[PDB]
Amino acid sequence: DWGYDDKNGPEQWSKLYPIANGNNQSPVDIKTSETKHDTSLKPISVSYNPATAKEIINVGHSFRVNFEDNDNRSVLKGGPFSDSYRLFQFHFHWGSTNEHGSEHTVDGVKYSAELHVAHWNSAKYSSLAEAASKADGLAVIGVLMKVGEANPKLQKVLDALQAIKTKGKRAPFTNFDPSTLLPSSLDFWTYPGSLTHPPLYESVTWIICKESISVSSEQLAQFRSLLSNVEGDNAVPMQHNNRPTQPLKGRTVRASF
Ligand SMILES: [Cl-]
Ligand SMILES: [Zn+2]
Ligand SMILES: [Zn+2]
Ligand SMILES: [Zn+2]
């Protein structure tokens, strides 16, 4: 399809998905001496309703927690946005070892994993599908995860993994507010960018927290224990799913702080 292996992975994605060398590609390195101040940035506000949580799914390259997105029970507003965005999903990226799992980097530093909390512009568009290709259609919070102490907010998430071990398995995942995973400071950087895997649409406004959150070495072990194959086939552990950083191509990263 496309994947993270040497034959189908990120360096190879341009053959099928030419926008991979576009001008608004995500995974970037944020250089802090080159970010620009902005006084127009509002604080980021999140208000999610735990009753929107729906399901956890093993999609083969990764795993996702989907939320009901039929109404505005769970929205992101403020920051750079005038439209309120509707939460639809969160998931993680991680690497083969502790040294490099994050997608975004800050002054060259690689963290051990990265949380993404994804939203779509429901003031302009009527569905995620319509929003997903539009320049202003997606909003995504990225949070860097620094290996150290066990993070207890991950518990419900990590305990659900044993029920979705192989590709395609899914299960109810209910009554959960993913604003509990966020850092306590909500200082951020913003830039215009992309989905970090195929289709790779340039549709995302990224919100990168300044503050990392923790994760233990054993908690990263549980993510890597997930299986990319379908039940019954030989076990093939999901060892990594992070893309290399991409050239800014003249874009400005703005800091809120
Ligand atoms: Cl994903
Ligand atoms: Zn590999
Ligand atoms: Zn995915
Ligand atoms: Zn992601």
The bound ligand whose nearest atom lies closest to the alpha carbon of 142 is 4
The bound ligand whose nearest atom lies closest to the alpha carbon of 238 is 2
Domain boundaries, the chain: 1-257
- Say how many Å lie between the CA of residue 239 and the centre of ligand 2: 7
The bound ligand whose nearest atom lies closest to the alpha carbon of 240 is 2
Taking the C-alpha atoms of residue 115 and residue 6, their distance in angstroms, rounded to an integer, is: 24
- Say how many Å lie between the CA of residue 245 and the centre of ligand 4: 13
> Which experimental approach was used here?
X-ray
Report the DSSP beta bridge partners of residue 236. none
What 149-154 contacts at long range (C-beta under 8 Å, 24+ apart), as own/partner pairs, is: 149/214, 149/216, 150/214, 150/215, 150/216, 150/218, 150/219, 151/213, 151/214, 151/215, 151/216, 151/219, 153/180, 153/181, 153/213, 154/181, 154/215, 154/219
> What is the residue type of 85?
Y
- Say how many Å lie between the CA of residue 162 and the centre of ligand 4: 21
- Say how many Å lie between the CA of residue 8 and the centre of ligand 4: 18
Residue with tokens 């993510």: 223
3-class SS string, the chain? CCCCCCCCCHHHHHHCCHHHHCCCCCCCEECHHHCEECCCCCCEEEECCHHHEEEEEECCCCEEEEECCCCCCCEEEECCCCCCEEEEEEEEEECCCCCCCCCCEECCECCCEEEEEEEEECCCCCCHHHHCCCCCCEEEEEEEEEECCCCHHHHHHHHHHHHCCCCCCEEECCCCCHHHHCCCCCCEEEEEECCCCCCCCCCEEEEEECCCEEECHHHHHHHHHCECCCCCCCCCECCCCCCCCCCCCCCCCEECC
Tokens representing 83 are 């439209």
* Residue 61 annotated to the active site: yes
> What is the residue type of 54?
K
Contact 223, 4 (CB under 8 A): no
- Say how many Å lie between the CA of residue 240 and the centre of ligand 2: 6
Resolution in A: 2.0
Tokens representing 43 are 């604080």
Taking the C-alpha atoms of residue 220 and residue 97, their distance in angstroms, rounded to an integer, is: 9
Taking the C-alpha atoms of residue 227 and residue 239, their distance in angstroms, rounded to an integer, is: 9
The bound ligand whose nearest atom lies closest to the alpha carbon of 237 is 2
First to last CA, the chain: 41
Q: Which of 37, 61, 116, 240 is catalytic?
A: 61
Other Cβ atoms less than 10 A from the Cβ of 234: the count is 6
- Say how many Å lie between the CA of residue 200 and the centre of ligand 4: 11
Tokens representing 242 are 């992070």
- Say how many Å lie between the CA of residue 154 and the centre of ligand 4: 17
Q: What CATH number should be reported for the domain whose range is 1-257?
A: 3.10.200.10
